[PDB]
Design a protein that fits this description.
Three copies of one chain form a homotrimer. The first copy, chain A, contains two helices and seven strands. By secondary structure, the first copy, chain A, is of the alpha/beta class. Chain A has a single domain, classed as 2-Layer Sandwich (Macrophage Migration Inhibitory Factor). In chain A, strand 6 and strand 7 form a beta hairpin. Strand 2 of chain A pairs antiparallel with strand 3 of chain C. Bound molecules: the ligand CC(C)C(=O)c1c(Cc2cccc(/N=N/c3ccc4c(S(=O)(=O)O)cc(S(=O)(=O)O)c(N)c4c3O)c2)nn2ccccc12. The PDB classes it as isomerase.
Chain lengths: 114, 114, 114
């Protein structure tokens, strides 16, 4: 899986250990081994949410499987929780796009997962 | 809806008011309240369009509905017009990927829209 | 087509020539003129792969068609090869997500490709 977060929160406000915590917490939520999980945080962004420049985030979670109605509700609770706790972003100023990737459409180690 | 633009145009060439203008114009174009609209602009990128470093943009628009043939034509005219007017990017050096998002695949406020 | 690479490799490690090299190599691989090929390299990113921050890359390739099982395996060997050779990223620390875009969902030149 791959999780990306883009935010107008400044880099100095991202705590030590944030990437590692996102890895572990996504491993816990998805059940996927942590070795397969990639995470990416992009602070200091020029962004707005509902016309406002208060802290917000736009995020993506891609996974081969483990995406669906109930799963996505659980990941949203988990990930909004972590953004609120660690980056002080209100959950109502977060969007997370979920992508259920076909294995044939994910490349790794010179091939794909098909 | 959420609109992202990535560009090699430098940050100092992004005029004041641009995020708010994108928000307003996208709200009107999609027929949705501006509270739903998120915008994100990423200048100073290392990018080429047709092998040229001439100003260019790579963009995304994600929406739960209001995405489709005619609608996307209209959005392209609107958004290329803005990028041309504000960032001086030629419309033929802009790509915009449109995504019609399922409500279950968009997280917000500790849950999804499903 | 568009190819984006996000990486923790520093900016000074990206060869001069790299964006042009990707443009040419992807034009050849997709069978489309280089005028249609957009490339975007984002270095110095805060990211982790498998919980470690050894050089890695998270990438996307979008195309209107020319996406599928064997074609994606081919792209993956090509792009991992370039990333290993030019940026010194191990292939088993690269993800590439592939997107087969509908023409109506790609904006360009004030309209779409439909
Ligand atoms: C120890 C290292 C080398 C390793 O074993 C790795 C592996 C092992 C590996 C190699 C090749 C294939 C592979 N698993 N592929 C798949 C393919 C499809 C899967 C699907 S599917 O598209 O619905 O069939 C569903 C699911 S599930 O999450 O719904 O069970 C999978 N786990 C799939 C899968 O793992 C797993 N992946 N990986 C990724 C990043 C980093 C390290 C590794």
């Amino acid at each position: 899986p791959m999780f990306i977060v883009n935010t107008n929160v400044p880099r100095a406000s991202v705590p030590d250990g944030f990437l590692s915590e996102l890895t572990q917490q996504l491993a816990q939520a998805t059940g996927k081994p942590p070795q397969y999980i990639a995470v990416h945080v992009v602070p200091d962004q020029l962004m707005a949410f509902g016309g406002s420049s208060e802290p917000c985030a736009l995020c993506s979670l891609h996974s081969i499987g483990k995406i669906g109605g109930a799963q996505n509700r659980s990941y949203s609770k988990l990930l909004c929780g972590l953004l609120a706790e660690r980056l002080r972003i209100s959950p109502d100023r977060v969007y997370i796009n979920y992508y259920d990737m076909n294995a044939a459409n994910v490349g790794w180690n010179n091939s794909t997962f098909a």
